[PDB]
Design a protein around this ligand. Sequence first.
Ligand SMILES: *[C@@H]1O[C@H](CO)[C@@H](O)[C@H](O)[C@H]1NC(C)=O
Lengths: 48, 47
Amino acid sequence: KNIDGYFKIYSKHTPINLVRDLPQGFSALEPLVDLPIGINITRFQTLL
Amino acid sequence: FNCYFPLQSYGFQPTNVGYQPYRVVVLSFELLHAPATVCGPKKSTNL
Ligand SMILES: *[C@@H]1O[C@H](CO)[C@@H](O)[C@H](O)[C@H]1NC(C)=O
């Protein structure tokens, strides 16, 4: 996400032994670094 | 033609007080509402 020109990236890497769906638990995504880009965002796609 | 080259090589050379060339630099600041990218030095003090 980007707010007030500063891109805020949040991430979290946790292990799990399950392939059905999202497991039980809580996790707060931590903003690691702030990026001053200042761009509008209304569309996006995944590059695989 | 009559309308000729508007550019001209400057009259200086490794040989070349009013004819001394001066260098100039400007830091064009874009003051639009945008994320801050250049800010001043905040000299911290001892605690
Ligand atoms: C974001 O949207 C505004 C809407 O007027 C537009 O002026 C601006 O150029 C857009 N941002 C970019 C990076 O194009």
